[PDB]
């Protein structure tokens, strides 16, 4: 929507970058690059300006990256970034939809899954998340996240050959391949930290090293504790070095030091290397924490905005088919900064995690009252319109309650009760809850506790089959489909995580795992069932087969709906019944209205909603039926989900 | 407010009722009575020349009636007429509190009452309704609602000397007796329909007598049934007449005609008479039914108001210290026109049961949510300030779930499904229903249940006692202080009904009385457990006396804050939480908050509603106590009521 | 609509008073008198209490006082106190008309005014403000508000026999004679000052008397001045007492101190006796400056308020038929509190001039625009509903500018920039002005500048005269008329001023006589044209006669018209054409809509209001013809006024 345009100073250092562009490219081509660099040049000039010292010197060093990686780039991948710069919505479109895999546990190797692509179509997928895949340190390494080789596909998953055919294949399915970026910390085993370990000055830069305490001890006062059960703070002491390391997650994660501009340089090298290997999509991993500062929590922190954007700039001069993705599982008051505010705005990530929806939906389900969640969001401060929210349920991680103070006051509940309830409900201990879940990650010190499990077992269809009660059943599929109808109607790309459409529950096996034991997260990590898949499709009166046909149903209706365009964002309705979330997407073609109840009970909603949005013959697009109405309501089903227009 | 001006066309009638007048009275005592006729003729005449044909004529004699009836009233009674007549917002003061008693349930006798008096007080009684106290028929009389001589007490109460010494009694400790007005029907019984039944024409057209089913089955077509157990429809035969005849009620309760300019001139006569018998309050049972109209369902006609009106003015000529009360059980958008609107404004009755009010409490307490209750409130139109409502919990008859469509709609309610709810909950057949009430007069034809039971055995105090669980225990009594908190709060004259001050339970004793069995009302028109109210007075802690020492409480906080008198209305708050009802009351001294929690669980609310209502330290005067504020809220204790100003 | 009850501590004081009062009184004339004396002991007392020390020993001198004026008291007043108590809404009424006339400047005499009481009743006058009749001293008296005895009538008026003639001729047509009480200062000549200067130490303390500067030096810090061009400051050196007094208003006016019981005492018997000779309203002159208070302006102190309470309960107690009508000319947010606030509602002065609507109505017609207007009286707070204003377009005093610079800010004005041009516009400075007015009491000091001249002169007509433009002498006269119609159509006692209704002119006769000659003042209060009066009558198309019938149809319009009661309150209308005002008075019977347009052009306003307010068919009752609606709009004549009903 708004292009930086070339400060007048800038112009003599362009004239440098394009002549040093000049002696690697020549013809049509440079020409090519020459423009795109002229494009984001503004953009990634202020963005390294901000955070390190010499700009001008560090874009001479950055161009040859910028040329190597433009040279090394294919025709088919140069056609899908010039087919991308023509349709720059693409990502935003109502056929956009994702799944998020663990390799092994899906197909076995990234071989295997080009054997599992007719199962993705199948689910209209058109963007598929495998999570960490790279070499990482062996025994413990955080599902993937403990990175030893950022150039080497693990071992047991195959070779970058493997990738290469893998996203060739994908890309003739129209499959968007989504990538990790764990940029913020390495293995302690990487050539990166053991070069630092031997006292090489270069590498002990890349880190963040203290001969003492004296400063660890004051940045401690103010930083909280991600993993208090794993590596109490925020500091390990490393034998070899003699010195005390930042390690914000896993003592064996090594935070990098991002105030060095040579990490800067690894990292856009790393991308474009990455890009050219048929990578679309980058997870920026932990993205908050890149930037650290004395006195603040070491999140958030207005550099970590600069970086992002020269990152972003680099991925837009020579990739321009990639997107970013940020992790920032943040309050939702600090969360839409992902997306690009002040100077900042839209000249960041793409898309974001909306964990604000995500927790919204489940507190929701808790509590059948819908008033919290129409707060928060409607409180939420729109996106740039080049921008998309990725909408989930569940994922790889276990839930954190990010519930603002001021947004439960708003609608009369306490912030820290409603926080404290929805772990006791989740964990299965208030009473009559549905929900089978572990605690995960308990700070005694602060109270926070954080939810695991499937989302087939936190909605209740665990219990259900324990109990043997049919309605139970049914109501606990009927939840499931209410969650992924909001994150498939809300506007964004849909994270379908591996397993949810099979209903997919708790798996306690990783308890006889001495490397996962300790990680309940694992409970929600289970291995593919190709059995219940292949029941689900063949029957689907089954539970799998409810979940599976249920979804698809949502799945194919979203993606023919253009109302779902994520350049347009949900305006949240008055929760007029308590118990019924609703919201207005005003589309050119006309207005669609949501309705979700968030109750087991029948409820009725009143029908000039309807017609105030301007819909005089309400239509549901999920049943293909008029909506009923009868003196002047509409009558709701039991965790029934309306997609509504004329 | 608004005097009606004298039209000039009415000077030759008023000249002629004056010239009339002084053939009567002679002095001062002329002069007195004469200013008064000027004053409400202008009312008396616009109400009667709406409804019969010869309006000055019926005025020539009802002159000679008002003359009679000041010559026979008592200095002391005219004393009370001036007082009141310098002070008419009196019955609207917070330190109006009323008691609703059938006498022999209450002191045996209107004697017995004298030595009761002592108990009232304590409980800041300063009106008392006696329950239809005058000669009834035999046998079944609907609990004295089927008179048969209005100018004879019922002989097992005494006779009309006693009811002169003790209204004498009532008087020297300020309170008003409340009468029964059966002025819609006499018992069969009565010398009228005696005349009537003999074939006396005159006294067959007090009646509505019809010689064949013609009539009767047209009007039958848009009629409802009040009593479709006792009495289908609404005509019953009488042999000796050879007549059907018009019977709303019982079959024994005939339908007077209000056509007939006699039937009004022995209304006139018998309230005078009364009056000056030391009655203060009529309450107008069964107003609403006294104009019939075929194609109607013969309620709330136009007419009612003009004969009201006609009827008041009468009183205010020769009684200035008497108050009308409105029996109007009607729906929420008919209730407002029995205090006065249009041409009527501020001329009928003083006041009327909230029936809304009363129906809202209980539907709030079933439901845990307060938002039809708010809804419905708000939309209720304003009343003339010279007015007041009468609130209740509960009173001699049956809960009519008077709940309108149009507010149920609005708060995303089905009224026919909350209607169902509200007698499923209290008839005991609901899924952990805490009460145990009786369904009564079952109409298979339209669905409409209404509920029979005391206010302690439709809160759960029954079932908590049988069970011996005390936290039920606990959360009964809170139930019913909450309950009283808000008929007590309002605005308006609280109607104590006789026992629920102990927590009176069902009484199944009516089973037995073959008078009484078909009548299940009679489960809540217990007699009076003089033992039960010396161990509430003496044993705070017993639930008797919690009940007891929680309602005293309540009323001695009510007497000594200014904002309750009646004159302000309620300002109904948004339910920022759906279980806290919220409303203020704008004094000249200021804002009165009233917070009502309807949930048995602890409850939030914003405190930034007290300082929008200009409350900067925010006093609760039931605890004695500063309101806790803590995280921008407010902590409601579970039933928690609140009465807050600066 | 409150009435304040007797608190337990002052039961044994009522007792002592209704002792006393058995002494002087018996039979039903003591009981009239107690039960009075009861009902508003609670406001006398509450009001004395709070400014002297010994309230109750003051209360038992004060009753021989009440009981004396009880028994001097006619038959025929005690009739009308009878009529009021019963009607206590009269003044309210839309019959209510008002005069306001010198007596010489009228009739000549007192007996003068019997003739031309068919002039007055022409009028539909109910109410005779005759200005200050009161002995005065002699030559300059501020055209009688310099008292030299209250207990004589004006010698060349004649005697209190006379003035007890008038007011039975008056009484006899329905008219309600009004007296000035000028109770904050008596002429230096008066009996008091004579008795202070001859060093009689009990007549010194009913002044402000000073041995020296030390003290009137620190009061004059924080005094405005009222008449700096006649008296400069507010203290006066007296040769005889060798003492300085205070002097707010001329040298010869000596401010009483309200501090001692004393003074209190002289207006209790003044107002009584007073009513006794058929006074029906008091004109409570200068009632904001009766309390002093150092560091303060000396005006709208708490216990002005308190004193107001407890002099008008005295008039509830011995005379119900008078009325107290405040003289507060005072900033717009300092008005409300003279019509009781707090603890004072409706407790004190029955009715206030509305200075604030008065100021509106001549900026509105010298800017064409009435947003300001609509502001200022959107924001007034709403009086207590037995309370009245009293509107007017002119009156015997100079114009000042009360506008708050907050209302005049919410509409794009400069509070100071907007006073300064009324000043330039209605003295004749300002380009194009109609206005021929004169600079009246002009600040150098402070910049204040107030307008003396007719209604007449300051709305064009002398300019029109001057210049024989007939179209200009049309919308001169169609001002008055505007003008007229919303003091009579705003809600309120319309007090019309001697002269306006012939539209007479500025008089400048006053220049030649010495004694008025330095009070340009007396431009305004012209002798009346009894010639000009006639020939207003008998030539309609005379500017007298258009004048003279305009207001005459808009008085007899006005009469007819329910809704114009004053407790109801005009609810102002967003001005969506800047030009009209607009109101709604919101009657039992239906909605009015006031329409006025301030321009001299033809105004368009948006029909779509008279839906909004309930109307239908919108009905003129000025013009007796259906409102005109085309394309959405109603057509407004210049100057037009319309009162629409349905």
Same mark, same amino acid.
């Given at each position: 929507?708004?292009?930086?345009?070339?400060?007048?100073?800038?112009?003599?250092?362009?004239?440098?970058?394009?002549?040093?562009?000049?002696?690697?490219?020549?013809?049509?081509?440079?020409?090519?690059?020459?423009?795109? $660099? /002229? +494009?984001? !040049? =503004?953009? #990634?000039? @202020?963005?390294?300006? &901000?955070?390190?010292? *010499?700009?001008?010197? %560090? $874009? /001479? +060093?950055? !161009? =040859?990256? #910028?040329? @190597?990686?433009?040279? &090394?780039?294919?025709? *088919?991948?140069?056609? %899908?970034?010039?087919?991308? !710069?023509?349709?720059?919505?693409?990502?935003?479109?109502?056929?956009?939809?994702?799944?998020?895999?663990?390799?092994?546990?899906?197909?076995?190797?990234?071989?295997?899954?080009?054997?599992?692509?007719?199962?993705?179509?199948?689910?209209?997928?058109?963007?598929?998340?495998?999570?960490?895949?790279?070499?990482?340190?062996?025994?413990?390494?955080?599902?993937?996240?403990?990175?030893?080789?950022?150039?080497?596909?693990?071992?047991?998953?195959?070779?970058?050959?493997?990738?290469?055919?893998?996203?060739?294949?994908?890309?003739?399915?129209?499959?968007?391949?989504?990538?990790?970026?764990?940029?913020?910390?390495?293995?302690?085993?990487?050539?990166?930290?053991?070069?630092?370990?031997?006292?090489?000055?270069?590498?002990?830069?890349?880190?963040?090293?203290?001969?003492?305490?004296?400063?660890?001890?004051?940045?401690?006062?103010?930083?909280?504790?991600?993993?208090?059960?794993?590596?109490?703070?925020?500091?390990?002491?490393?034998?070899?070095?003699?010195?005390?390391?930042?390690?914000?997650?896993?003592?064996?994660?090594?935070?990098?030091?991002?105030?060095?501009?040579?990490?800067?340089?690894?990292?856009?090298?790393?991308?474009?290397?990455?890009?050219?290997?048929?990578?679309?999509?980058?997870?920026?991993?932990?993205?908050?924490?890149?930037?650290?500062?004395?006195?603040?929590?070491?999140?958030?922190?207005?550099?970590?905005?600069?970086?992002?954007?020269?990152?972003?700039?680099?991925?837009?001069?020579?990739?321009?088919?990639?997107?970013?993705?940020?992790?920032?599982?943040?309050?939702?008051?600090?969360?839409?900064?992902?997306?690009?505010?002040?100077?900042?705005?839209?000249?960041?990530?793409?898309?974001?995690?909306?964990?604000?929806?995500?927790?919204?939906?489940?507190?929701?389900?808790?509590?059948?009252?819908?008033?919290?969640?129409?707060?928060?969001?409607?409180?939420?401060?729109?996106?740039?319109?080049?921008?998309?929210?990725?909408?989930?349920?569940?994922?790889?991680?276990?839930?954190?309650?990010?519930?603002?103070?001021?947004?439960?006051?708003?609608?009369?509940?306490?912030?820290?009760?409603?926080?404290?309830?929805?772990?006791?409900?989740?964990?299965?201990?208030?009473?009559?809850?549905?929900?089978?879940?572990?605690?995960?990650?308990?700070?005694?010190?602060?109270?926070?506790?954080?939810?695991?499990?499937?989302?087939?077992?936190?909605?209740?269809?665990?219990?259900?089959?324990?109990?043997?009660?049919?309605?139970?059943?049914?109501?606990?599929?009927?939840?499931?489909?209410?969650?992924?109808?909001?994150?498939?109607?809300?506007?964004?790309?849909?994270?379908?995580?591996?397993?949810?459409?099979?209903?997919?529950?708790?798996?306690?096996?990783?308890?006889?795992?001495?490397?996962?034991?300790?990680?309940?997260?694992?409970?929600?990590?289970?291995?593919?069932?190709?059995?219940?898949?292949?029941?689900?499709?063949?029957?689907?009166?089954?539970?799998?087969?409810?979940?599976?046909?249920?979804?698809?149903?949502?799945?194919?209706?979203?993606?023919?709906?253009?109302?779902?365009?994520?350049?347009?964002?949900?305006?949240?309705?008055?929760?007029?019944?308590?118990?019924?979330?609703?919201?207005?997407?005003?589309?050119?073609?006309?207005?669609?209205?949501?309705?979700?109840?968030?109750?087991?009970?029948?409820?009725?909603?009143?029908?000039?909603?309807?017609?105030?949005?301007?819909?005089?013959?309400?239509?549901?697009?999920?049943?293909?039926?008029?909506?009923?109405?009868?003196?002047?309501?509409?009558?709701?089903?039991?965790?029934?989900?309306?997609?509504?227009?004329?």
């Amino acid at each position: 929507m708004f292009s930086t345009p070339l400060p007048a100073e800038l112009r003599p250092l362009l004239e440098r970058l394009l002549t040093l562009a000049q002696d690697e490219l020549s013809g049509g081509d440079l020409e090519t690059f020459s423009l795109r $660099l /002229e +494009r984001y !040049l =503004p953009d #990634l000039h @202020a963005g390294l300006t &901000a955070v390190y010292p *010499d700009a001008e010197g %560090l $874009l /001479e +060093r950055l !161009l =040859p990256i #910028l040329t @190597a990686a433009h040279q &090394a780039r294919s025709a *088919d991948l140069r056609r %899908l970034d010039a087919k991308r !710069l023509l349709a720059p919505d693409w990502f935003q479109r109502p056929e956009m939809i994702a799944y998020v895999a663990y390799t092994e546990r899906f197909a076995g190797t990234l071989r295997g899954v080009e054997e599992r692509i007719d199962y993705l179509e199948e689910l209209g997928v058109r963007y598929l998340h495998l999570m960490p895949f790279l070499k990482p340190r062996p025994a413990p390494h955080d599902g993937g996240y403990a990175v030893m080789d950022y150039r080497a596909v693990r071992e047991d998953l195959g070779t970058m050959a493997d990738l290469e055919a893998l996203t060739a294949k994908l890309r003739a399915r129209g499959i968007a391949l989504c990538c990790d970026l764990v940029l913020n910390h390495v293995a302690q085993e990487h050539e990166w930290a053991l070069r630092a370990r031997r006292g090489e000055a270069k590498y002990q830069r890349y880190f963040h090293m203290f001969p003492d305490r004296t400063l660890p001890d004051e940045y401690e006062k103010t930083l909280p504790e991600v993993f208090p059960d794993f590596a109490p703070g925020n500091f390990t002491f490393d034998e070899e070095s003699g010195q005390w390391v930042w390690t914000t997650f896993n003592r064996w994660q090594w935070d990098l030091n991002w105030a060095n501009p040579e990490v800067f340089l690894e990292f856009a090298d790393l991308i474009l290397w990455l890009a050219n290997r048929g990578v679309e999509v980058f997870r920026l991993d932990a993205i908050a924490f890149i930037w650290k500062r004395l006195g603040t929590n070491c999140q958030n922190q207005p550099e970590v905005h600069a970086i992002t954007q020269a990152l972003r700039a680099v991925a837009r001069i020579v990739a321009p088919a990639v997107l970013f993705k940020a992790e920032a599982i943040v309050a939702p008051d600090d969360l839409i900064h992902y997306l690009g505010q002040g100077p900042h705005f839209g000249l960041l990530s793409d898309t974001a995690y909306h964990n604000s929806l995500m927790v919204q939906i489940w507190s929701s389900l808790a509590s059948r009252d819908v008033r919290l969640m129409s707060e928060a969001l409607r409180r939420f401060p729109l996106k740039p319109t080049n921008t998309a929210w990725c909408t989930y349920l569940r994922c790889h991680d276990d839930i954190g309650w990010a519930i603002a103070d001021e947004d439960a006051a708003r609608v009369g509940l306490s912030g820290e009760a409603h926080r404290r309830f929805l772990s006791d409900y989740y964990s299965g201990r208030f009473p009559a809850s549905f929900s089978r879940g572990l605690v995960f990650q308990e700070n005694p010190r602060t109270g926070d506790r954080r939810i695991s499990g499937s989302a087939a077992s936190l909605a209740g269809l665990e219990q259900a089959l324990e109990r043997g009660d049919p309605h139970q059943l049914h109501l606990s599929l009927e939840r499931l489909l209410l969650g992924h109808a909001v994150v498939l109607g809300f506007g964004g790309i849909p994270l379908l995580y591996m397993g949810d459409e099979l209903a997919l529950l708790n798996d306690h096996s990783y308890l006889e795992e001495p490397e996962h034991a300790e990680d309940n997260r694992w409970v929600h990590r289970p291995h593919m069932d190709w059995e219940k898949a292949a029941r689900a499709k063949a029957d689907p009166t089954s539970p799998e087969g409810r979940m599976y046909h249920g979804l698809r149903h949502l799945i194919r209706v979203r993606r023919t709906t253009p109302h779902f365009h994520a350049a347009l964002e949900a305006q949240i309705l008055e929760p007029r019944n308590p118990h019924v979330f609703g919201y207005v997407r005003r589309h050119p073609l006309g207005n669609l209205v949501a309705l979700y109840n968030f109750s087991e009970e029948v409820q009725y909603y009143p029908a000039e909603v309807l017609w105030q949005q301007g819909l005089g013959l309400p239509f549901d697009r999920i049943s293909g039926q008029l909506v009923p109405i009868e003196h002047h309501l509409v009558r709701l089903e039991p965790y029934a989900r309306l997609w509504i227009t004329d």
